[PDB]
Each structure stands twice: as C-alpha cells, then as structure tokens.
Amino acid sequence: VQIVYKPVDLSKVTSKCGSLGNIHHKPGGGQVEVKSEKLDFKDRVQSKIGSLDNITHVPGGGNKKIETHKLTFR
Amino acid sequence: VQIVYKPVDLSKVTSKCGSLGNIHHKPGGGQVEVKSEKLDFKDRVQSKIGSLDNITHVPGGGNKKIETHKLTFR
Amino acid sequence: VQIVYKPVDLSKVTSKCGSLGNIHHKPGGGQVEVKSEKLDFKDRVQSKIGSLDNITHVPGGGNKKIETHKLTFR
Amino acid sequence: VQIVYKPVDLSKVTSKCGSLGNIHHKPGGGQVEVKSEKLDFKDRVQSKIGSLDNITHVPGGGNKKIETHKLTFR
Amino acid sequence: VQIVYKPVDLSKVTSKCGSLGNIHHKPGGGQVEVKSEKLDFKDRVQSKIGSLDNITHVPGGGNKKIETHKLTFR
Amino acid sequence: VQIVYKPVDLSKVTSKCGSLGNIHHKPGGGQVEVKSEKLDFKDRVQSKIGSLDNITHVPGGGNKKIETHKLTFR
C-alpha cells in the first residue's frame, strides 16, 4: 500500500466594511413556565429548560472557516 | 504500508472595518419558573435549567478558524 | 509500517478596526424560580440551575484559531 | 316659598361568598413607544402617556354605593 | 323663604367571606419609551408619563360608600 | 330667609372575613426611558415622570366612606 494526501489551500475569506453604526436591540420582557417529574439524561446531551435569553452579536468581521480531515484506515 | 499527510494552508481570514460605533443593547426584564422532582444526569451532559441571561458581544474582528485532523489506524 | 504527518500552516487570522466606540449594555432586571427534590449527577456534567447573568464582551480582536490532531494507532 | 327634601333609604347591599380561591394573574411583557413635540394641558385634565400597567383586584366584597344630592336654588 | 333638608340613611353595605385564599400575581417585565420637547401644564392636571406599574389589591372587604350634598343658594 | 340642614346617617359599612391567606405578588423587572427639553408646570399639578413601581395592598377591611357637604350661600 501507498497513500498520499495534500489538500492545498491558498483560500481567502475577507470583508471590507465602512461603519457598523447604529444598532439598537431593545427586547420587552416575557414569561416561561416548564413542569416535569423525572428527567434522565445520558451519553452526549445538550439541553436547555426554561430559558429567556437575549443576544446582540455585532462582529466587525465574522469570517469563520471550518475545516476537517479524517484519513481513517484499517 | 506507507502513509503520508501534508495539509498545507496559506489560508487567510481577515476583516477591515472603519468603526464599530453606536450599539445599544437594552433588554427589559422577564419571568421564568421550572418545576421537577428527580434529575439524573450521566456521561457527557451540558444542561441549563431556568436561566434568564443577556449578552452583548461586539468583537472588532471575529475570524474563527476551526481545523481538525485524525489519522486513525489499526 | 511507516507513517508521516506534516500539517504545515502559514495561516493568518487578522483584523484591522478603527474604533470600538459607543456600546451601552443596559439590562433591566428579572425573576427566576426553580424547584426540585433530588439531583443526581455523574461522570462529566456541566449544569447551571437558576441563573440570571449578563455579559458584555468587547474584544478589540477575537480571532480564535482552534486546531487539533490525533494520530491514534494500534 | 317652602321646600322639603327627605330621601329615606333602608337600602342594603350585600354579598355572601364561601371562598375567593385560586387566582393566578400572570402577564407576559410588552413594548410601548410614544413620540410628540409639544404638550399643552389646561383646566381639568387626567392624562396617561406611555403606560404599561397590570392590576389584580380581588376584594372579598365590593359593594360600592354612590349617592349624590343637589338642591340648587336661585 | 324656608328650606329644609333631611337625607336619612339606615343604609348598610356588607360582605361575609370565608377565605381570600391563593392569589398569585406574577407579571413578566416590559419596555416603555416616551419622547417630547416641551411640556406645559396648568390649572388642575393629573399626568403620568412613562410608567410601568403593577398592583395587587386584595381587601377582605371593600365596601366604599361615596356620598355628597350641595344646598347652593343665591 | 330660614335654612335648615340635617343629613342623618345610621349608616354601616362592614366586612366579616375568615382568612386573608396566601398572596404572592412577584413582579419581574422592566425598562423605562423618558426624554424632554422643557417642563413647565403651574397651579395644581400632580405628575409622575418615568416611574417603575409595584404595590401590594392587603387590608383586612377597606371600607372607605367618603362624605362631603357644602351649604354655600350669597
């Protein structure tokens, strides 16, 4: 056997922007209620129960570049 | 067997920005209620129960670059 | 067997920004209530119960670069 | 001239009630905005401008009895 | 001239009640904004501007009895 | 001239109540903003500007009895 692997990138991921400027995030309130009895959870679990949650995310550049490799072999 | 692996990057991830400027994040309140009896959790668990949570995330550049490799072999 | 591994990066992750400027994060209050009886937790567990929590995260550059390798072998 | 006035009451205003019991008043939030320039007001004025207001009025007896007289004369 | 005035009351205003009991007043939040320039007010004025206000009024008897007289004469 | 005035009351205003009991007044928060330039006020003025205000009024008997007279004469 012979194996070779060479994922070249000259990749570019880019933004020009003049001004992010006037951004008003202004949420009025709210009401949440959850009931239960028993809660089991097991192995890989991401839960939220009964959340009231506001965000304001203003990156001046948000150029995510996700990349993955797997040369699995038996 | 012979194996070779050479993921080259000349990758670039970039932002120009002039001003982040006026950003007003101004949340009014709220109300949360959770009930339960029993809560089991096991192995890998991320939980939130009964949260009220505000964020304001203003990076002047947010150019995440996630990268992963796995040359698993048997 | 022969194995070789050479993930080269000349990678770059970058931001120019002129001013982060006027940022007002101004949350009004709130109300949370959680009830339970029994809480078991085991192995790897991240929990929050009954949180009310505000953040303001203004990095002048936030260019995370996450990278991972695993040449597992048997 | 002769004038006489004798509004007799043996009036009765009444309530029996066994229990006022389970009353849940649970309003989620809201958002109000008012604009103006000039506001004049004069003589007898009752105003509200830009209100967000909740009530819960549970009298165990609410037997108002309004009564008025006026023997005006010239 | 002769004038006479004799508003008799044997009036009664009444309530029996066994229990006022479980009363939950639980308002989630909210958001108000008012703008103006000039505000004049004159003579008898009751104003509210930009209120966010909750009440819970549980009298165990609320038997108001309003009464008024005016024998005005010239 | 002769004038006479004799508003008799044997009036009664009353409440029996067994128990005022479980009363939970539990307001989550909120947000108010008022702007102006000039504020004139004159003669009899009751104002509130920019209030956020909660009450819980639990009288065990609230039997107001308002009464007024005016034998004005010229």
Side-chain angles (χ1 to χ4, degrees), chain F residues 25-39:
Chain F
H25 172 93
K26 195 184 167 175
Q31 196 127 43
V32 171
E33 183 186 14
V34 183
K35 302 174 185 178
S36 170
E37 302 176 2
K38 187 167 175 180
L39 288 95

Side-chain angles (χ1 to χ4, degrees), chain B residues 36-39, chain C residues 35-39:
Chain B
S36 170
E37 302 176 2
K38 187 167 175 180
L39 288 95
Chain C
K35 302 174 185 178
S36 170
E37 302 176 2
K38 187 167 175 180
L39 288 95

Side-chain angles (χ1 to χ4, degrees), chain A residues 15-30:
Chain A
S15 188
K16 292 165 79 171
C17 180
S19 67
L20 301 191
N22 329 359
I23 294 159
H24 307 259
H25 172 93
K26 195 184 167 175

